[PDB]
Amino acid sequence: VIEANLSLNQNQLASNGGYISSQLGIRNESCETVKFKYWLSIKGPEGIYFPAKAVVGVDTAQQESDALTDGRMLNVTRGFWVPEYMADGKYTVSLQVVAENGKVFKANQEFVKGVDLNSLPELNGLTIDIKNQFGINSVESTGGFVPFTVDLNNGREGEANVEFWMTAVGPDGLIIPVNAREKWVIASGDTYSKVRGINFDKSYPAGEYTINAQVVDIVSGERVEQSMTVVKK
Amino acid sequence: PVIEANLSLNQNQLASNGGYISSQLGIRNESCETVKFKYWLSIKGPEGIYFPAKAVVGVDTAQQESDALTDGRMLNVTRGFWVPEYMADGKYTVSLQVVAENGKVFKANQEFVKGVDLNSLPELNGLTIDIKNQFGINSVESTGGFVPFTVDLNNGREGEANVEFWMTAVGPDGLIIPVNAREKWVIASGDTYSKVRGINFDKSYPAGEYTINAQVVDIVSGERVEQSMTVVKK
Known part of the structure; x- marks a missing residue:
């Protein structure tokens, strides 16, 4: 069993976008060591889906696994730019973990661009x-x-x-x-x-x-x- | 394959002002026993658009009702839908979808374009x-x-x-x-x-x-x- 946690430094961007920093938390809450893969993705308005990773040259990396032992925990920080051209509206950030045995764990947070967070x-x-x-x-x-x-x-x-x-x-x-x-x-x-x-x-x-x-x-x-x-x- | 689904559109290319698309839906029972199923027609489009083929005059209050085809039998019906101008130009997929009583999913898809050339990148x-x-x-x-x-x-x-x-x-x-x-x-x-x-x-x-x-x-x-x-x- 894995516990995934996600926190966003900010949840509301003006229409011209901005930067969002994420705190990723993956904890192994079992006695056995656990093998898994994880990543961070964004869903948005108008059919937008994009990975949180952005590269300066050509993407050539693979998806690598991780391992956590008894009670051990992973903690990383990842940020991404939301550019102005993207649609104003609601976005979901998703930390996704797939354990070696097929179990899926997800932690989500929303942010808005160009609209009030607590408005319909x-x-x-x-x-x-x-x-x-x-x-x-x-x-x-x-x-x-x-x-x-x-x-x-x-x-x-x-x-x-x-x-x-x-x-x-x-x-x-x-x-x-x-x-x-x-x-x-x-x-x-x-x-x-x-x-x-x-x-x-x-x-x-x-x-x-x-x-x-x-x-x-x-x-x-x-x-x-x-x-x-x-x-x- | 116990069910065979077929879909045909009367046209595949609309201008940016949109238009009307008529379609033929065929669901054939290939097996020798009665098959019970649900079916519907849906559209997927650019900019995250999804919509049902069905439009109603007032409030929609119906549920997806089941149908049944005895040995070798077939169902043929027609459905039409308006593609309004406000919808994004680009590629659309129309999907005839059938879910049998046992969970088997059968689909038949056709494409149309709006405001772009049909055979162009x-x-x-x-x-x-x-x-x-x-x-x-x-x-x-x-x-x-x-x-x-x-x-x-x-x-x-x-x-x-x-x-x-x-x-x-x-x-x-x-x-x-x-x-x-x-x-x-x-x-x-x-x-x-x-x-x-x-x-x-x-x-x-x-x-x-x-x-x-x-x-x-x-x-x-x-x-x-x-x-x-x-x-x-x-």
Whole structure:
């Protein structure tokens, strides 16, 4: 058994990006020595994925393992630049460890670029509040149901013409529909409110599902994404 | 293979203003007994876009209902979807997906493009990105394997290009595995930056589908372009 810990020196960048320093902690909490591989990666808006390592010449390194003995622990510091060209929005930093026996351990932290950390995602005046209703992060292999709350609040002076949908992006290349495409013309000060659930049928493959919601202002053409995780065991 | 899935699109090339795509879905039971399944049509696009083929007038309240085909029987239906102008130009994959009652997953995919040429390399305004699975290796053994990728960025501009480049493998269990560290190159006019980079799939890595994801950025214009390939670890 391994314990992975991740800490970011800062969690909010202005629109022109900046530097983020990470404190990586990998602890072996067992009597036996453990062999493993680890790395640090970033997920972001608009399909951005990138490695935390950046090189001055040509990348030619391999992925090397590590070993920790009884109660022993690894501690490293790694930083990375988030450049201005990257989309404003929410990013997830992921410290990932795969032990020799196939066990996966992950420690994540979020940072934002160009938006307030403690504000709802937003399209001008239109706030987007989409949540895993009861904080259910996994379901049994024999199946389970997970409800999500959806609240699109139009804080604008004018009406908002929006499109909304959700999928579940999972194992084996699956993209399961969770919410069909809906269109709503929402008056100033009004709200689109709704609860939507997905039934994870017993037949669906085990692994990680990213419940991915999308909201578009079809007049401005701007799009906002909200991603949430559910594991089927 | 107990189920055979087929997908056809009525057109594969849209202009930047988007348009409407009609499709034929075929699901055939190749076996001699009844098969129960669920199926749907979904789209994957540039800039992290994913959307279902289905659109509704009001509130969507339905659930994915099951279907069944007796021995030798087949289901044929049609689905259509609008590709709005606001969606990013680039490559899209339409996917017919079937999950049988026993967990078996069958897929049939087709591609369309929006606002770019159908048979042309991905491009950043004169700089072409040619990234390929070198030996057409689509899967590796559970005990491990290695897959090399060729990388070629041709600069057909009049001036020099400043690019940033990297690669990850996006896989099962939320893994995002570094394949190529972030590099910055200056490529002169008429030049081609050429490289080969592979990923070792260690034995310990989880079984399933890995999307090898390459990204290229014109660090002057800020424009980004992606190239995706699939390797399956058995």
